[PDB]
């Protein structure tokens, strides 16, 4: 969602 946090390209925390 907007829950996912992307710290660098092609990466995410909290990915759905």
């Amino acid at each position, epitope marked *: 969602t907007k829950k996912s946090i*992307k710290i660098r390209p092609r990466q995410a925390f909290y990915a759905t």
Partner: antibody
Framework: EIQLEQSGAEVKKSGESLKISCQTS????????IGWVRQMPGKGLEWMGI????????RYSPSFEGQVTMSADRSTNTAHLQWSSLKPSDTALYYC?????????????????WGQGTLVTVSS | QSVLTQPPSASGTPGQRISISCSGTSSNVENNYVYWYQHLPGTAPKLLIY???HRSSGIPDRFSASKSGTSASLAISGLRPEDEGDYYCAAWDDSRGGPDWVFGGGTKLTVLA
């Protein structure tokens, strides 16, 4: 237009409990993380943590785990920060900010809209 | 790992170009996204640059940023009296393997009046 409106300045005695607030407008409150940032007098900005109102998930900075509690009231679109026992060293300006950016279809990565700050003074 | 180091202060005269630096580690500035904030008296911190070098909407093009290895730099050309205040780099730090946000120490910019 997105706005975060923080509660008014506080003057407290050490040992006393306090809850400060950040009420949000102009976007879906459940869908974005909110962060909290401390600024001690004469010092720089320090990240404290983030809180996700949609499901109450949270992440604290190491220095802050167990020292302060983030929460949210979805009935009023308000995020809160609370201490049970204020110390003089909690004297600071406190900001809430939305984690957003909306640079891509999904996700968040930058603190974009900020509250105006709440000053908290604590004395023994 | 989880610290951004900036010079505590800088100054310049109106119309000069100046540059603000920020040193990180492999945990933050080298591989993750870096941001820059202005903090002016009486106002909340304001995002100037996101994702290393992207200027934020509405910020004038006299603000720019770059990143080389563990260093990042904010350039302000055409310095104005209005620019005096505090400038912070920020980054994501993944040392604990999650999303930790870190602000730099802050640089106080004086525009010599």
């Amino acid at each position: 237009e997105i706005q975060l409106e923080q509660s008014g300045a506080e003057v407290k005695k050490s040992g006393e409990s306090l809850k400060i607030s950040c009420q949000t407008s102009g976007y879906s409150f459940s869908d974005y993380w909110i962060g909290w940032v401390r600024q001690m007098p004469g010092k720089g900005l320090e990240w404290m943590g983030i809180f996700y109102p949609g499901d109450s998930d949270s992440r604290y900075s190491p220095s802050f785990e167990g020292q302060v509690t983030m929460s949210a009231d979805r009935s009023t679109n308000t995020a809160h920060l609370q201490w049970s026992s204020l110390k003089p060293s909690d004297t600071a300006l406190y900001y809430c900010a939305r984690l957003g950016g909306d640079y891509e279809d999904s996700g968040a990565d930058a603190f974009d809209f900020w509250g105006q700050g709440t000053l908290v003074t604590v004395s023994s | 790992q989880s610290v951004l180091t900036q010079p505590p202060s800088a100054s310049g005269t109106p119309g000069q170009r100046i540059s603000i630096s920020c040193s990180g580690t492999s945990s933050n500035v080298e591989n993750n996204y870096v941001y820059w904030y202005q903090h002016l008296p009486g106002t909340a911190p304001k995002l100037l640059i996101y994702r290393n070098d992207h200027r934020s909407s509405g910020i004038p093009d006299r603000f720019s940023a770059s990143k080389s290895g563990t260093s990042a730099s904010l350039a302000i050309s055409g310095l104005r009296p209005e620019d005096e205040g505090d400038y912070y780099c920020a980054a994501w730090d993944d040392s604990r393997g999650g999303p930790d946000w870190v602000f730099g120490g802050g640089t106080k910019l004086t525009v010599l009046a």
